[PDB]
């Protein structure tokens, strides 16, 4: 035969992407602790 075959295609993500808890967005934990510290200090200052 000839020109008797078509083809589909699939896709893989990036390795650098890896997980979802990869800091800069997941380290919002540590940052939240910073923000809570900020909030406590501001509460005192406003008082």
């Amino acid at each position: 035969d000839v020109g008797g075959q078509q083809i589909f295609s699939q896709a893989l993500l990036n390795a650098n992407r890896r997980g979802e808890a990869k800091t800069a967005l997941a380290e919002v934990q540590a940052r939240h602790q910073e923000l809570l510290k900020l909030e406590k200090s501001m509460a005192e200052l406003t008082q």
């Binding site: 075959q5 078509q6 083809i7 589909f8 699939q10 896709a11 893989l12 993500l13």
Partner: protein, 428 residues
């Protein structure tokens, strides 16, 4: 006493389901499937058996194999059904099609681990099963996703871990393409065929469809449902609804007068709406069967009309009727074949069609040269074989073959003819 949440309710009747016909399939289904979940757990534990976890419904289009699934899902005091359309699993990223078919069972496993044998039934219904789950081993796409999906479902329905609190329903029109491993007992045990109704089924369906119309004093006193059920010979379950809709459209169009002029809609005209009998007869010219397409041809072959110019005609007709009676009344004579021969132009096909039409058998079919014209040899053989294989369904059947000589392409010059078709017919 029954259980705290016994699924199928204490008082339940097949009459309130709302499905006409199929009064034996429902028995079988409920006996095999739901008979063991309304029983004291101690006894079923003593018997040492396990509940079935499969169900398959197959048949031709329009017989009512999706209404049943909906009603089973809605009327059984279980969790909400998990409906999945046919090719809704596939996905782009590698390894995500398989995950989508194992994210359906997670809650069942979550509950079965905690509350043991007191969990509530979980039901998930696959629509158009045969689209994805084909026989693995072919070369369909060039990627290899279908096989993985099939493998995942195989490993999750039985697998190495027990679930015992799940139920899956399937529906399809072609049951010969499903992979074999799915149909083994333990996966899709009970398989049911839903076929076209009989006259009593047609009456039941007609009664079901025209219920609110009657009870709201919106139907004339002239219509006789028995007559209508008798007139619609090969109508399936999904065309009586079309008939009702068409009759209603006819009855409605006499007031609004769509297109000629509006504003005729006034309280007086719409305060006495009533569907008469003439509307149904008019509607019978719009909806037409799809399986009863060969009785019309038989009806057109005696268009010239029968005239009894002599008495031999009466005698032959009586003989044919006698043979019809014999085949109807006997038990061991399951096959009777006749030959009708004579000089050309003597009117044989019309006489045979006349005997056929007065029989009243459920199934009547005709094979004639006109149907096979333009086909190849193999197509003709396949067509004949399929037509013969379609005659082993109904209890009583009539088959008429026209002009045997021309079916094999006989010409006296050679002599030339096709041996294969002759052998096929002789064997059949």
């Amino acid at each position: 006493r029954p259980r705290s949440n016994a699924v199928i309710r204490p008082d339940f009747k097949f009459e309130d389901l709302g499905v006409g016909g199929l009064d034996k399939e429902f028995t079988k289904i409920f006996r095999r499937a739901f008979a063991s979940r309304i029983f004291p757990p101690s006894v079923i534990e003593k018997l040492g058996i396990s509940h079935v976890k499969g169900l398959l419904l197959y048949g031709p289009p329009g017989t009512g194999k999706t209404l049943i699934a909906r009603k089973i899902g809605t009327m059984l005091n279980a969790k909400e059904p998990k409906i999945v359309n046919g090719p809704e699993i596939l996905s782009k990223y590698v390894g995500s099609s398989e995950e989508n078919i194992r994210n359906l069972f997670k809650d069942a496993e979550a509950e079965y681990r905690a509350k043991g044998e007191e969990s509530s039934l979980h039901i998930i219904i696959f629509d158009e099963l045969d689209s994805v789950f084909k026989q693995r081993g072919s070369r369909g796409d060039g990627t290899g996703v279908g096989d993985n999906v099939v493998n995942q479902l195989l490993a999750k329905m039985d697998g190495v871990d027990q679930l015992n609190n799940i139920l899956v329903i399937g529906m399809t029109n072609r049951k010969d393409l499903i992979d074999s491993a799915l149909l083994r007992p333990g996966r899709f045990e009970v398989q049911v065929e839903i076929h076209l109704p009989d006259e009593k089924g047609r009456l039941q369906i007609f009664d079901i469809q025209t219920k609110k119309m009657r009870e709201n004093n919106m139907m004339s006193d002239d219509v006789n449902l028995a007559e209508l059920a008798a007139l619609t010979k090969n109508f399936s379950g999904a065309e009586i609804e079309g008939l009702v809709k068409s009759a209603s459209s006819f009855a409605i169009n006499k007031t609004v007068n769509i297109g000629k002029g509006a504003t005729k809609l006034n309280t007086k005209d719409i305060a006495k709406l009533k569907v008469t009998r003439e509307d149904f007869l008019n509607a019978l010219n719009d909806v037409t069967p799809a399986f009863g397409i060969s009785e019309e041809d038989l009806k057109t072959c005696v268009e010239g009309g029968m005239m009894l110019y002599s008495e031999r005609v009466n005698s032959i007709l009586k003989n044919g009727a006698r043979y019809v009676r014999q085949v109807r009344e006997s038990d061991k004579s399951r096959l009777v074949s006749l030959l009708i021969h004579g000089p050309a132009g003597s009117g044989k096909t019309a006489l045979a069609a006349e005997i056929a039409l007065k029989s009243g058998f459920p199934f009547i079919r005709l094979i004639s040269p006109n149907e096979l014209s333009g086909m190849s040899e193999s197509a003709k053989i396949a067509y004949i074989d399929n037509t013969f294989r379609d005659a082993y369904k109904s209890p009583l059947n009539i088959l008429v073959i026209d002009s045997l000589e021309t079916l094999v392409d006989w010409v006296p010059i050679g002599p030339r003819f096709s041996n294969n078709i002759l052998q096929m017919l002789k064997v059949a």
